[PDB]
Design an enzyme around this catalytic site. Structure first.
Site, PDB file in Angstrom:
ATOM      1  N   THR A 292       0.905  -1.206   0.093  1.00 21.11           N
ATOM      2  CA  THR A 292      -0.001  -0.023  -0.047  1.00 21.11           C
ATOM      3  C   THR A 292       0.923   1.173  -0.195  1.00 21.11           C
ATOM      4  OG1 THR A 292      -1.977  -0.800   1.056  1.00 21.11           O
ATOM      5  CG2 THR A 292      -1.812   1.403   1.205  1.00 21.11           C
ATOM      6  N   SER A 293       0.480   2.119  -0.897  1.00 19.57           N
ATOM      7  CA  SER A 293       1.024   3.603  -0.816  1.00 19.57           C
ATOM      8  C   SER A 293       0.152   4.664  -0.861  1.00 19.57           C
ATOM      9  CB  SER A 293       1.969   3.698  -1.996  1.00 19.57           C
ATOM     10  OG  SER A 293       2.814   2.724  -2.265  1.00 19.57           O
TER      11      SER A 293
END
Ligand SMILES: [Mg+2]
Ligand SMILES: [Mg+2]
Ligand SMILES: [Mg+2]
Ligand SMILES: [Mg+2]
Ligand SMILES: [Mg+2]
Ligand SMILES: [Mg+2]
EC number: 3.4.25.1
Lengths: 204, 233, 125, 212, 226, 196, 195, 222, 196, 195
Positions: free
Chosen positions: I1-2
């Protein structure tokens, strides 16, 4: 489980005026079970005295080893080994088993025959030398012995006064240890006479 | 039982002739990541007390809210809330110490080491420590974490026993604190250059200094150091 | 390869002589003179620095060598054989004594160790 | 530890050592291992010292409440069962207890109950509990008779603890003796093992292995 | 243990406390932690005490033989290289943590060595349980171009920080100064700030206090003639 | 640790911080992580200090003996010797090494050898705990055939950020420049790079 | 195996050793002799891990018999016990140690004295008037401490031994199926076939 | 995993005289190899001529002392300001300690005072509340160093009268408060020499019919 | 996840990738990690999907009930509700949430709530596994009071790098713009952001 | 505890139960009666963990005695065994289960039949002609399989039981100090005082 406290026992050594004293209890046990009241822990090679605490099989093995080595020393050197030299030999011999050691707490005591200087020394199981001026302690009641010696000891005691001091140090330390006691021996060592005394103590 | 996540490092402090000094850097670490650079870890309570907190930051923020609530509660039905019946450092500490020990006793600790610094009603210096275990102790110098190992030895050279306190001025004490903060910046991998410092004096009151920096650093000697043994170039 | 000389090169002749030892002693006889004198408060050992060439720096060739701080040695005969014996003598003083007893060996015992090395070159393969 | 108790013609003999150890360290040589539950009942202490102390003093309170309510001396059976039922509620929690509840009543006569922290409750004639129990059993089994005199029975109990004190590293210090009669227990003194050993060795001719 | 090393103008100084412990018990109150590798190369050891004395004697022995073989005075980099390669081979099982210092024909040197075989260069170093207390003092007072007198003062002050603040350190301060073109001076018990006060009472016993069962003469002499 | 090597027009530059930690204690704040295995073949070390020092010493020995027999070794050759040690002893080593060197025939070259003992030739390489925080920055800012001054700025800015975020990194920024002109050492202090 | 006892009286050494061999759930044998004759006046009883006990005992027996033939001479009990101790002291630091405890009962023909040595698997040797291995001592030593005299006859020793076995049979949980008793004196080794 | 316990070191010593009692303890507080405080009082006056010290884990030690002091207060409220006798205090402390049988106060507790006949009294507790009246008791880090010395010098163990050679024991003659304080000081001086956790200062509280008095002595600070 | 949120002149913008993985398998490549708890208070989710969805749903309920009684809540209020859930249930949650919102009085605000349950008000915030690789880039490129177009570019470039290096991140870049003008959704596809 | 046996013959049920009570290293008692009378014609023997055995047995006894007084009627052996099984089946999913195995020997006065039920600590009930718990069955069942007849007399049952006990005393490692034997028939419960 802990090899250094299966069999139990203690040794203490002190210096005095022109003399040294070394003493030990007589107990050998299998943990809680008392097995022998005649297991002496002090040996001598010429005028050099060696006390050994810890795992009893190693105590016996090392005594036989240092008898072996000091006998060959004497044949080649044409003289008895001195306390300072023997101390180094014990250290050497223990460290050669650095990663499979003898589970012991040796104590050297004696008077140098040439200088007349009193000498004592102690070791850990792996060969590190503790060369104290005052006293050396070893065994399952070493804490108790440190307490006794630290308060009872004073420098330059005469042979017959040193006997009382070291005897009371041993006895009262052993009586506060479950795995020490069952009799005691004290050696009083002068330049050319050694007296050996068995002490009367409680047998529990 | 938990583990600390976002953490604050050393809090250092000492007594001097007219009061106490306390200091702590402005870093909130996330393991080895130096995540948050503007975290205030000295929290003043009234004008006579400063509570310094290290360890878990989420628990610090909880303790911060407890102290804020303590001031509100003390003012309730209390005409002398800003006079004789104001919060003392000794009251604030004892409350925290109670909470810390209760929390460890439920096996759910506030993961912190805390130093309460202040001056009492009668002018006496107050400096006492409490941690996640509920352990408490007082001393002329107090420090948490790395500060305990590096700051205390330096601060104890100024005030070694109780009788050294009246002989120590605020200038000498602040100097010793600021130097200790520099030493910690050299040697603590979870420290920062920016810090806060608070002085609580019985005469001049509470002086709170923000945005201080470690200065007068020695690095020049690094240029001569080459290799790890035999290398010459 | 492998050292396939696993047998003695010094053997008894019919007359009971060990030829190679006698011949070694002949090589010693050809060597430059060296001497030793013992006093009540010291010992002295001496020899001639027979320089092979005047261009050679004879200070770089040490005929008299320190074995331990209290023991020194000098020779007559083959120089290279002496040099390696000094190396072995210095080492054996440590390995078979100092590393055991924490002190340097007495003169007679170091001599005994050097003698043992020379004896083995007289019997080994 | 070494604790014993045995029934005989003249009632019950209770004998205990005095030593307490923490590992190899001898913490105390003056431990009271016989709890005086009341003037008629005795309990011995082995295992957890606190557990035995706390719960056998508590037992004394329950016995007192019983005789206040029922206007009659509690039986040894009932007293022992109050304790065994209590510790059984705590089973699993880690209580450590090995005790002999000793008493002498009209309806029962001299009675001994071994009570255990796993919930065991055993009536018997001879019991021996502790690290030195096996040594004391030897002397007891080979010398026990029902028709022992009070004097000889007291000595047997003393001698059996001495046997354990000598061999067991974790037993010693001193011997405490009690004689339980129908009219209550009678204390028969504290006996230092150090002095007792040499005295017994000479007078009895035993312990020839030891030099004195 | 607290051990430090400090570079100065014309050489290097090392120092150490004198307390050796097994657990919380003080085994020796006046222990010698400054070891000699060669006349002008000295080191101080922390960690397993047998290992520090054993590894310094072995390298010190081989250094002596190397010095005789090469007809040159021993170098600190040789001691360093021999120590680290020995310690690396045993993968940290030999628990020797050393500060190595000395002078040789190349100049004055100061190194540290961790048990796994890694080495470091510096002008000031500290090792042992009291290294953080000592390093605090060093980081507060160290400067470039220290004199001999300033370096001895700094080194001993750093050891004192360990003595007072670290429970693993205590008793006395030993110092050894190695200056270029001079004999190394070993200053055993340079400071003695921990002498025990006189006891309240004498515990000398009256003669005959201890009970004795048997007396005998021990024959320490050899088998006699005639 | 934060280490990197960058090729540019005139050759290659190695860069590194100076912090060595034992847990949270900084055991050495002025460490030299740029190590010389040959005149114009250097390396940046990360991982176990004992392991990387032991490896570098062995490589230096191998390249010294190579030079005595076959003349100056290539940077590729040096990387291969590093790899051979790291790959064959992967079970007992914790070493992440960047090898950088200057030939006249090949000019500036950079090889990275991660934990496994694999080799990767790259225009530039980053490694050490602090490198994670500058993958984005370095990828966005690296250009091929930069000048000496541009490459010094690129490394200085990159390691500045790595130091800023990584607690395991810090102290001074050391650099070593490898060109035809020779070997130049550079040092940059906190007061310089922190304000960037 | 389980219980092995020893007692040195005036003019002989008496060794008692259990007869049971239990392999887990069943008692496979009730007549097992846990002893070997090392020399005409030296007997060794043994107990420990299965297999290792007999392997060790026979190995020692072979070595002493070899010495006896080579020198045409019987080693003293002290000498034999010292040999045995060394073997066990060597064994304890081996790849796989002998898990064997022994009692060596011998009559020294030179000194005209009986001798009893107790040696455990670690190589811990002690000379005793009476000894045991395992839990045997816990039950029996209090009886032996009380009744033992150094001037006891062989018949008195056997009676004291019976009392020890009776106490074992009473208080021990395991059924060791009685004991085989053997006497070592100036005339050699003999077995008491009714006990 | 969270460990609710810690070790703050320290050593304490209680000795009961004929008409007095002393409870002493060092003033050093520690964790691991660091000193927290060189002067942190460990022995406390709890009122009713009773002194107390709970050595070991300082948080549990402080908690227990606090609760006992509180128990003394409520004993006065509930029982018409009756003086809490030392034996009653001891039994009360057992119940405080055993109350946490399954999550114990990690301390070795000692109290001192006078019994109802005016004679000196010392009581000693384990962490879960087993207790006993004693003449002599050291507690904490250097307890094993001090007790053997006290056996020899207070109870004259292993000491016999010269000339008799073991036949007559040295008689147990009563010690004065000045004599006891000498033995206390020498015990702590010796303990300080050989135990790393013992030092800085020694604070002694002396209990007589006149009340509670304090004495302080410096100890080595290394 | 970013994930990231950035304040700018006209308000605040939230940004996120769209990849959700179960080990190395991409369970969902078009995930919407930007979630609405109120009209102009949104959040970015990282950590346990079950936990962060459960928390967000509860917060949305709390803010809905708040609004019915006391009118529109502040962004600070929303962050406090998030914190209360995360802090009090820290033992049983794995959630890293960024809260972003627009008031007219306070304008754009960003709060980050990491694992522990602490709150930190920031000009911008980054989180999720991919954020590690862009600490350097974001610190060097963030300015206060940027325009809408500049902030979109900053987020697009930042998440582009995070996606490039982090295997746990990828897919499309989703964004949500919060201003006085209203709520605008933006989407950017691989062919756009990969060539940046 | 250890060995508990049961055999149902023509007109009675015979229960045999060991007398030993061992606490670890020592045998504390050699006359322990591991049985309780639930009603005049119902007997229950038991073995399992210390404390739990007697606690459970007395708890059951109290409940059956309570039923007997309330209804002025003795429950059938089948009914009692079903009650006991349920208690154990409830117990096994408790916080701390009863670790107790039982044999219920009863004479049903309505049907004029002896009945033997075997129930383990899980609540596993089986009606059998002969049964055991623990390792007892391993040694004895081969003998019972061979010799058992449903028309055996009480005297023949006792003889077959003696053969079973003899085999146990031969091959079992533990000394269980013999057995107490009790007979349950139309006249009630009685103990065989010589066995
Ligand atoms: Mg004893
Ligand atoms: Mg004993
Ligand atoms: Mg390695
Ligand atoms: Mg940094
Ligand atoms: Mg043995
Ligand atoms: Mg100290």
């Amino acid at each position: 489980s802990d090899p250094s406290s299966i069999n139990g026992g203690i040794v203490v050594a002190m210096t005095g005026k022109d003399c040294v004293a070394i003493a030990c209890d007589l107990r050998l046990g299998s943990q809680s079970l008392g097995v022998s009241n005649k297991f002496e822990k002090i040996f001598h090679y010429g005028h050099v005295f060696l006390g050994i605490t810890g795992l009893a099989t190693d105590v016996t093995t090392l005594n036989e080893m240092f008898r072996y080595k000091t006998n060959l020393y004497k044949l080649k050197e044409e003289r008895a080994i001195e306390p300072e030299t023997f101390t180094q030999l014990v250290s050497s011999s223990l460290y050669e088993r650095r990663f499979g050691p003898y589970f012991v707490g040796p104590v050297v005591a004696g008077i140098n025959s040439k200088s007349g200087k009193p000498f004592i020394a102690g070791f850990d199981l792996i060969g590190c030398i503790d060369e104290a001026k005052d006293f050396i302690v070893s065994g399952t009641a070493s804490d108790q012995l440190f307490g006794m010696c630290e308060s009872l000891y004073e420098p330059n005691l005469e042979p017959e006064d040193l006997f009382e001091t070291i005897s009371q140090a041993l006895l009262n330390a052993a009586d506060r240890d479950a795995l020490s006691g069952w009799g005691a021996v004290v050696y009083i060592i002068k330049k050319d006479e050694v007296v050996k005394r068995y002490l009367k103590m409680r047998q529990d | 039982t938990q583990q600390p996540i976002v953490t604050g490092t050393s809090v250092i402090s000492m007594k001097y002739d007219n009061g106490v000094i306390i200091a702590a850097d402005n870093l909130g670490s996330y393991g080895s990541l130096l995540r948050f650079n503007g975290v205030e870890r000295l929290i003043p309570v009234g004008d006579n007390t400063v509570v310094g907190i290290s360890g878990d930051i989420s628990d610090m923020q909880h303790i911060e809210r407890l102290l804020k609530d303590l001031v509100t509660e003390n003012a309730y039905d209390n005409p002398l809330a800003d006079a004789e019946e104001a919060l003392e450092p000794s009251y604030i500490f004892e409350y925290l110490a109670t909470v810390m020990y209760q929390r460890r006793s439920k096996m759910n600790p506030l993961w912190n080491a805390i130093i309460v610094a202040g001056v009492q009603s009668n002018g006496d210096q107050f400096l006492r420590y409490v941690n996640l275990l509920g352990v408490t102790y007082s001393s002329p110098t107090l420090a948490t974490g790395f500060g305990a190992h590096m700051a205390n030895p330096l601060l104890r050279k100024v005030v070694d026993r109780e009788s050294d306190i009246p002989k120590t001025t605020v200038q000498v004490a602040e100097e010793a604190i600021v130097n200790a903060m520099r030493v910690l910046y050299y040697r603590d991998a979870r420290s920062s250059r920016n810090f806060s410092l608070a002085i609580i004096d019985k005469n001049t009151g509470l002086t709170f200094k923000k945005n201080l920096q470690v200065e007068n650093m020695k690095w020049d000697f690094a240029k001569d150091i080459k290799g790890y043994g035999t290398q010459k170039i | 390869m492998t050292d396939r000389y696993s047998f003695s090169l010094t053997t008894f002749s019919p007359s009971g002589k060990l030829g190679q030892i006698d011949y070694a002693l002949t090589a010693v006889k050809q060597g430059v003179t060296s001497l030793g004198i013992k006093a009540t408060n010291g010992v002295v050992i001496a020899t001639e620095k027979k320089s092979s060439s005047p261009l050679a720096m004879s200070e770089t060739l040490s005929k008299v060598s320190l074995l331990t701080p209290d023991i020194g040695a000098v020779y007559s005969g083959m120089g290279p054989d002496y040099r390696v014996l000094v190396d072995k003598s210095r080492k054996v003083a440590h390995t078979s004594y100092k590393r055991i007893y924490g002190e340097y060996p007495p003169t007679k015992l170091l001599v005994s160790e050097v003698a043992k090395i020379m004896q083995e070159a007289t019997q080994s393969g | 530890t070494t604790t014993l108790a045995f029934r005989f013609q003249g009632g019950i003999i209770v004998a205990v050592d005095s030593r307490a150890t923490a590992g190899n360290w001898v913490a105390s040589q003056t431990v009271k291992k016989v709890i005086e539950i009341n003037p008629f009942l005795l309990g011995t202490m082995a295992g957890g010292t606190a557990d035995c102390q706390f719960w056998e003093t508590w037992l004394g309170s329950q016995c007192r409440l019983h005789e206040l309510r029922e206007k009659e001396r509690i039986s040894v059976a009932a007293a022992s069962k109050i304790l065994s039922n209590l510790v059984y509620q705590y089973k699993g929690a880690g209580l450590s207890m090995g005790t002999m509840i000793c008493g002498y009543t009209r309806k029962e006569g001299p009675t001994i109950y071994y009570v255990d922290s796993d919930g065991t409750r055993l009536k018997g004639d001879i019991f021996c509990v502790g690290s030195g129990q096996t040594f004391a059993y030897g002397v007891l089994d080979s010398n026990y008779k029902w028709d022992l005199s009070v004097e000889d029975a007291l000595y047997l109990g003393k001698r059996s603890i001495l046997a354990a004190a000598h061999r067991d590293a974790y037993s010693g210090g001193s011997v405490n003796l009690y004689h339980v009669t129908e009219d209550g227990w009678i204390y028969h003194g504290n006996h230092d093992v150090g002095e007792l050993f040499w005295k017994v060795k000479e007078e009895e001719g035993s312990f020839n292995n030891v030099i004195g | 243990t607290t051990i430090v090393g400090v570079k100065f103008n014309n050489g290097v100084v090392i120092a150490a406390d004198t307390r050796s412990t097994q657990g919380p018990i003080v085994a020796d109150k006046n222990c010698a932690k400054l070891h000699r590798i060669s006349p002008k190369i000295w080191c101080a050891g922390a960690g397993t005490a047998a290992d520090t004395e054993a590894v310094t004697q072995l390298i010190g022995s081989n250094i002596e033989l190397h010095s005789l073989y090469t007809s040159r005075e021993p170098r600190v980099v040789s001691a360093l290289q021999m120590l680290k390669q020995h310690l690396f081979k045993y993968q940290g099982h030999i628990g020797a943590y050393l500060i190595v210092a000395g002078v040789d024909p190349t100049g004055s040197h100061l190194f540290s060595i961790h048990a796994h075989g890694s080495t470091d260069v510096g002008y000031y170093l500290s090792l042992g349980s009291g290294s953080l207390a000592a390093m605090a003092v060093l980081e507060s007072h160290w400067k470039q171009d220290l004199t001999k007198e300033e370096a001895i003062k700094l080194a001993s002050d750093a050891i004192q920080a360990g003595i007072w603040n670290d429970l693993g350190s205590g008793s006395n301060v030993d110092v050894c100064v190695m200056e270029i073109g001079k004999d190394a001076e070993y200053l055993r018990n340079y400071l003695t700030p921990n002498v025990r006060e006189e006891k309240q009472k004498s515990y000398k016993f009256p003669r005959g206090t201890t009970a004795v069962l048997k007396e005998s003469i021990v024959n320490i002499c050899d088998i006699q003639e005639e | 640790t934060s280490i990197m090597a960058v090729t540019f027009k005139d050759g290659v530059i190695l860069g590194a911080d100076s912090r060595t930690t034992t847990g949270a204690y900084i055991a050495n704040r002025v460490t030299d992580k740029l190590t010389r295995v040959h005149d114009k073949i250097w390396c940046c070390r990360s991982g176990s200090a004992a392991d990387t020092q032991a490896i570098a010493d062995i490589v230096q020995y191998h390249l010294e003996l190579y030079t005595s027999q076959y003349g100056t070794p290539s940077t590729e050759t040096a990387a291969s010797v590093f790899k051979e040690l790291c790959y064959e002893n992967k079970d007992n080593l914790t070493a992440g090494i960047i090898v950088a060197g200057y030939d006249d025939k090949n000019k500036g070259e950079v090889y990275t050898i991660p934990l496994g003992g694999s080799v990767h030739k790259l225009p530039y390489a980053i490694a050490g705990s602090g490198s994670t925080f500058i993958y984005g920055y370095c990828d966005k800012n690296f250009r091929e055939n930069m000048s000496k001054e541009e490459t010094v700025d690129f490394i200085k800015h990159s390691l500045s950020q790595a130091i800023k975020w990584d607690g395991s990194s810090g102290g001074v920024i050391r650099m070593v420049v490898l060109t035809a002109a020779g070997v130049e050492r550079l040092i940059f202090y906190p007061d310089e790079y922190e304000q960037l | 195996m389980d219980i092995i006892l020893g007692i040195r009286v005036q003019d002989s050494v008496i060794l008692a050793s259990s007869k049971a061999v239990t392999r887990g759930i069943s008692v496979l044998k009730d007549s097992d002799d846990k002893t070997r004759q090392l020399s005409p006046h030296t007997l060794m009883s043994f107990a420990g891990e299965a297999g290792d006990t007999v392997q060790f005992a026979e190995y020692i027996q072979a070595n002493i018999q070899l010495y006896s033939i080579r020198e045409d001479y019987e080693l003293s009990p002290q000498a034999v016990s010292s040999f045995v101790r060394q073997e066990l002291a060597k064994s304890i630091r081996s790849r796989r140690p002998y898990q064997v405890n022994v009692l060596i009962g011998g009559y020294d023909k030179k000194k005209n004295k009986p001798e009893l040595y107790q040696i455990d698997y670690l190589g811990t040797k002690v000379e005793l008037p009476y000894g045991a291995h395992g839990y045997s001592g816990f039950y029996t030593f209090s009886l032996l401490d009380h009744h033992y005299r150094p001037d006891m006859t062989t018949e008195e020793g056997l009676d004291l031994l019976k009392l020890c076995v009776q106490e074992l049979e009473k208080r021990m949980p395991m059924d060791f199926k009685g004991v085989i008793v053997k006497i070592v004196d100036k005339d050699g080794i003999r077995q008491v076939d009714d006990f | 995993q969270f460990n609710p316990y810690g070790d703050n070191g320290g050593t304490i010593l209680g000795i009961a005289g004929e008409d007095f009692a002393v409870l002493a303890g060092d003033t050093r507080n520690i964790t691991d190899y660091s000193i927290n405080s060189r002067y942190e009082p460990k022995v406390f006056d709890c009122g009713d001529n009773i002194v107390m010290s709970a050595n070991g884990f300082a948080a549990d030690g402080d908690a227990l002392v606090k609760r006992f002091k509180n128990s003394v207060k409520w004993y006065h409220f509930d029982h018409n300001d009756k003086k809490l006798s030392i034996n009653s205090a001891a039994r009360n402390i057992q119940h405080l300690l055993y109350g946490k049988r399954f999550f114990p106060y990690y301390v070795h507790t000692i109290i001192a005072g006078l019994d109802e006949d005016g004679k000196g009294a010392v009581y000693s507790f384990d962490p879960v509340g087993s207790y006993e009246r004693e003449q002599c008791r050291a507690g904490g880090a250097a307890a094993s160093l001090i007790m053997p010395f006290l056996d020899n010098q207070v109870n004259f163990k292993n000491q016999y009268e010269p000339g008799t050679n073991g036949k007559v024991k040295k008689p147990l003659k009563y010690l004065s408060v000045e004599e006891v304080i000498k033995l206390v000081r020498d015990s702590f001086t010796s303990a300080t020499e050989r135990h790393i956790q013992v030092g800085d200062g020694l604070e002694i509280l002396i209990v007589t019919k006149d009340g509670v008095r304090k004495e302080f002595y410096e100890l080595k600070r290394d």
